[PDB]
């Protein structure tokens, strides 16, 4: 097992047009996990040549992928166009999956990802080379990467990272507020039942309402799922 | 003597922290005129084909050569963070880092576009430099220039109709609004007396383009190129 903590600073936000697919939510608070994985895959491909291919390789080795805002709150264009109040734009809009990340302080908006792999699946240096997550316009800079040893746990844990919400994972209590729901393409590939190899996965995602309050919850984890811990950082993934 | 039409696409909107100044409005529907001219100046300063000292002189003369600067949305409406934040409060804390920050949303969900119409006493900047503007406001206020036209302008006074923003100062009088909406906004004075009040068009419907009839005389004049009409100063 090996974990990576990756801090990513966004210029403005992102667009992930897979919001247009029937499986996924019709808009996104956060970049989908397959979108983040696609960026890793692209960075790996460039540092070589050419499909890929590689994204499915990452998915086969992936045990967990969770994320949390460090200093920002998402503002979906669906929220924006609503405040501004026609709606053929609810179907296949050019701006589908486009979301602004509003900083709560004077820094650029930042999100931290915590990925866990069955073994070392990517050169640490490569992670530093991610320049977009989502569309061409969704520009970012990676500002920290840390490779960590993780411990596998089950039972009751606390987490401030997003997590898949399938049978075996139970949100027992919200400790600090704003945990939304969002449906993504499943990032887990199989070379194992409730996460199996279904096409879509339901996640609970934290939404920060104040620079000082990180959303947190107590979660019971069993069945096909485990919690992976490195120091205070805990992310829920599959066994 | 010479005009530029510049069509700019925005990624998301802009932030102009000069909203923090007591001389300007506390929030902005549009990027301020000095903010747009500030972008032109940066483009000049960064251009390797223009010598350091020559570039400085050119920049120093922008305000003096400026006769008119007006703008209008082509397909979009602004939403100021002050409005977004008042709601989210379930705001002062939210507004602090958001000073002068505004989202642009397109009526057709395409990239929001704004057109500037500038008029100068002489050819104050090479056309190619206008194409190189990549932000207007903060460094995160990313844009792309998608059209630039240099045009001859004719100077008029009396009664004109315009769909561009205009300075709403002594000597310029609204005769009547033809189509809504027209807001007020106070900016730093881009000419050459600190701060200027502008009328600015706000596109609210897919059915009408903001338009009004204005009486212009005195120190102010209208500059026209084809259908485009912008009010600015005399000389």
Q: What is the CATH number of the domain that holds A130?
A: 3.30.70.3120
Q: Are strands A72-76 and A62-69 parallel, antiparallel or unpaired?
A: unpaired
Contact yes or no for A12 and B84 at CB 8 A? no
Helix (H, G, I), strand (E, B) or coil at A1: coil
Contact yes or no for B109 and A95 at CB 8 A? yes
Query: How far, in Å, CA of A101 to CA of A76, rounded?
Result: 8
Of the partner residues A80, A89, A106, the one whose CB lies closest to the CB of residue B79: A80
Residue A190 sits in which domain range? 2-239
DSSP H helical ranges for B6-71: 33-46, 52-65
Distances (CA, A) of A49 to A57, A120, A124, B104, B188: 16, 21, 18, 38, 51
Task: Give the closest residue to A25 by CA, choosing from A66, A76, A87.
Answer: A76
Number of Cα atoms under 13 Å in the Cβ half of residue B177: 13
Resolution (A): 2.0
Query: How far, in Å, CA of A227 to CA of A234, rounded?
Result: 7
Task: Give the closest residue to B226 by CA, choosing from B163, B161, B153.
Answer: B153
| A93-A95-A96-A102 Cα dihedral, nearest 10 degrees | -150
Identify how the structure was determined. Answer: X-ray
Distances (CA, A) of B89 to A209, A210, B37, B100: 9, 10, 35, 18
Number of domain units in chain A? 1
Distance from CA of B9 to the nearest CA of A (A): 12
Q: Which residues of B touch A80 (CB under 8 A)?
A: 79, 84, 103, 105
Task: Give the closest residue to B231 by CA, choosing from B175, B142, B156.
Answer: B156
Q: Which residues of A touch B109 (CB under 8 A)?
A: 77, 89, 93-95
Distances (CA, A) of A190 to A11, A122, A154, A187, A199: 35, 18, 21, 10, 12
- Report how many Cβ contacts below 8 Å link chain A to chain B: 48
Rounded (10°) angle between helices B52-65 and B33-46: 160
**Chain-centre distance for alpha carbon A150:** 18
Cβ-based neighbour number of residue B153 at 10 Å: 24
Torsion sign, CA atoms B12, A102, B89, A113? positive
Bond into A91 cis (ω within 30): no
Task: Give the closest residue to B68 by CA, choosing from B185, B170, B175, B154.
Answer: B154
Nearest residue on chain A to B15, alpha-carbon basis? A12
């Amino acid at each position: 097992m090996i974990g990576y903590l990756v801090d990513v600073e966004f210029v403005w936000g992102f667009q992930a047009r897979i919001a247009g697919l029937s499986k996924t939510s019709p808009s996104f608070y956060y970049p989908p996990p397959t979108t983040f994985l696609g960026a890793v895959a692209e960075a790996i491909a460039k540092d070589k040549g050419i499909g890929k291919e590689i994204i499915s390789e990452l998915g086969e080795n992936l045990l967990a992928i969770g994320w949390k805002a460090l200093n920002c709150t998402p503002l979906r264009y669906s929220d924006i166009n609503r405040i501004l109040a026609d709606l053929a734009k609810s179907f296949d809009s050019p701006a589908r999956g486009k979301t602004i990340l509003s900083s709560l302080n004077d820094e650029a908006p930042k999100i931290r990802w915590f990925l866990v792999f069955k073994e070392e699946a990517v050169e640490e240096k490569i992670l530093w080379k991610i320049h977009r997550i989502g569309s061409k316009e969704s520009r970012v800079a990676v500002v920290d990467v840390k490779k960590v040893k993780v411990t596998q746990k089950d039972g009751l844990i606390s987490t401030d990272y997003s997590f898949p919400a399938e049978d075996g994972v139970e949100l027992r209590g919200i400790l600090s507020q704003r945990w939304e729901f969002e449906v993504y393409l499943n990032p887990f590939e199989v070379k194992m039942s409730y996460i199996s190899g279904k096409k879509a996965v339901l996640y609970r995602i934290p939404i920060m309402t104040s620079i000082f309050s990180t959303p947190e919850c107590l979660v019971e984890v069993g069945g096909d799922f485990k919690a992976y811990e490195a120091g205070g950082e805990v992310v829920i993934g599959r066994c």
